[PDB]
Amino acid sequence: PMTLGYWNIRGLAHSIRLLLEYTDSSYEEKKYTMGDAPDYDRSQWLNEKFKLGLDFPNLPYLIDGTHKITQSNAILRYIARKHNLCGESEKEQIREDILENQFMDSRMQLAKLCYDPDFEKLKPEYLQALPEMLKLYSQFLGKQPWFLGDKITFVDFIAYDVLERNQVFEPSCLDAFPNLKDFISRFEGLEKISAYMKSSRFLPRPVFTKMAVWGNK
Amino acid sequence: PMTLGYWNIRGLAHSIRLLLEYTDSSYEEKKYTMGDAPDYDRSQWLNEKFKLGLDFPNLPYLIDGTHKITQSNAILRYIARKHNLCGESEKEQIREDILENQFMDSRMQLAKLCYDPDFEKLKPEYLQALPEMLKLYSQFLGKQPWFLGDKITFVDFIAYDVLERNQVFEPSCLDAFPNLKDFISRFEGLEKISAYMKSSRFLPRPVFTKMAVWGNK
Numbered sequence: 470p471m472t473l474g475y476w477n478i479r480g481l482a483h484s485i486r487l488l489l490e491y492t493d494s495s496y497e498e499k500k501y502t503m504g505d506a507p508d509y510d511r512s513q514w515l516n517e518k519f520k521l522g523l524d525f526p527n528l529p530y531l532i533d534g535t536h537k538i539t540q541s542n543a544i545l546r547y548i549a550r551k552h553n554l555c556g557e558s559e560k561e562q563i564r565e566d567i568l569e570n571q572f573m574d575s576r577m578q579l580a581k582l583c584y585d586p587d588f589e590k591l592k593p594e595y596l597q598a599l600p601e602m603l604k605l606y607s608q609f610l611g612k613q614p615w616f617l618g619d620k621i622t623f624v625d626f627i628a629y630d631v632l633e634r635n636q637v638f639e640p641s642c643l644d645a646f647p648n649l650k651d652f653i654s655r656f657e658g659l660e661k662i663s664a665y666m667k668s669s670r671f672l673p674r675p676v677f678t679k680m681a682v683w684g685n686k
Numbered sequence: 687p688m689t690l691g692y693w694n695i696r697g698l699a700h701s702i703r704l705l706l707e708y709t710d711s712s713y714e715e716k717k718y719t720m721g722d723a724p725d726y727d728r729s730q731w732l733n734e735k736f737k738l739g740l741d742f743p744n745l746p747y748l749i750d751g752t753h754k755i756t757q758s759n760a761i762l763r764y765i766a767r768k769h770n771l772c773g774e775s776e777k778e779q780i781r782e783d784i785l786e787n788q789f790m791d792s793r794m795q796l797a798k799l800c801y802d803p804d805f806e807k808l809k810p811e812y813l814q815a816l817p818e819m820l821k822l823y824s825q826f827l828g829k830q831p832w833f834l835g836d837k838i839t840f841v842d843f844i845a846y847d848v849l850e851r852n853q854v855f856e857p858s859c860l861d862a863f864p865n866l867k868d869f870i871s872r873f874e875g876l877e878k879i880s881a882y883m884k885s886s887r888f889l890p891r892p893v894f895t896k897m898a899v900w901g902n903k
């Protein structure tokens with residue numbers, strides 16, 4: 470079985486976990502636990518960090534026998550290639566590359582906020598900009614079932630994580646955007662995703678690490 | 687001709703500029719200028735930000751006729767595909783995806799620091815970590831001329847920007863790492879790269895925007 474190493478949270482493994490489940494991948498999780506405050510003791514990871522034979526040791530990581538992979542997008546692409554869940558044409562590849570990076574910027578905006586000591590002061594401005602961020606995603610998806618079009622690919626798994634987690638942050642945020650709401654349902658309704666989400670494994674919380682101001686538990 | 691839009695700085699356009707020059711691409715630059723302090727007035731960009739027909743308006747952008755591309759990695763991949771400067775095999779693609787995301791983490795570390803108000807206090811800790819960062823890049827490159835092996839690809843262009851800019855931040859940083867120094871020379875010695883670097887277009891500073899503590903000019 471493949472090994473997926475990450476913190477015992479949602480974080481950056483969510484899309485990877487879902488993709489692994491969707492693709493019916495044989496895998497098990499190496500789950501590291503961060504200590505509490507004031508420590509935020511990381512030693513579980515730190516001890517074996519340099520022992521896994523990763524070129525750029527990091528969480529998350531994927532071990533698939535010969536292949537040892539860090540960087541969450543690289544893991545996602547790796548698995549997506551293995552199961553034909555990639556953009557094929559130029560137009561699709563362009564769309565894929567734009568989305569992967571754009572979603573990453575959006576992911577990180579929410580993380581920057583929720584780790585910021587000034588969370589309470591900063592929250593409103595983020596919610597001001599929130600509709601415009603969703604609007605661009607909505608326009609882009611249009612009437613298509615999936616972000617690259619007819620066929621589901623890896624970005625849809627990124628898409629879901631970042632869009633859904635906004636909906637856990639601000640529950641009403643997708644209300645203006647019916648196609649994004651339908652996207653969420655489509656995704657969660659997928660036979661394997663649905664089965665997973667009802668299983669003991671599913672790990673939708675905590676969103677962030679114990680160091681977070683919001684979503685630490 | 688393609689249009690490359692960005693601020694009148696090095697920033698995230700460097701690798702793109704160099705790739706466009708290397709590939710002998712027909713291109714011209716739409717250069718936006720940020721105001722000074724206290725304003726940092728952005729209105730040059732802001733006015734026509736929503737008028738270029740980009741799905742996710744952003745700097746940098748590439749307009750290639752039908753194709754309008756934002757996100758710097760997306761732009762790089764776009765041009766790389768057009769000129770066969772991509773990882774072909776699985777092992778290459780894995781390496782490419784790892785490196786693109788890793789370098790981007792590294793890039794952002796320097797940017798976080800150089801935009802931080804506590805730049806002076808924070809600088810030493812970054813320089814503490816700096817050798818280990820370089821070491822992992824060095825090990826990964828090994829004896830190969832380019833990061834993916836025999837043939838140069840797009841990551842090399844990212845590689846150059848982030849590694850070189852560290853050498854502008856701390857000039858001695860590559861001294862313990864001869865293969866990285868040779869990488870820099872190999873890259874700078876490429877016929878078209880060399881010609882470009884000696885031309886009037888070449889824009890190696892400022893490193894960051896006027897809002898930066900380090901490398902604003």
Ligand SMILES: CSC[C@H](NC(=O)CC[C@H](N)C(=O)O)C(=O)NCC(=O)O
Binds near residue numbers: 480526540541787
């Ligand atoms: C909050 S996510 C946990 C964090 N990992 C990253 O930041 C990886 C980000 C990377 N860009 C990726 O996408 O994999 C981490 O603990 N990394 C290992 C480390 O710092 O030693």
Ligand SMILES: CSC[C@H](NC(=O)CC[C@H](N)C(=O)O)C(=O)NCC(=O)O
Binds near residue numbers: 574746756895
């Ligand atoms: C300091 S670079 C300038 C900054 N752009 C980005 O942060 C884009 C980053 C994106 N991840 C990319 O790589 O293109 C910017 O001015 N963006 C347009 C805007 O904010 O309106």
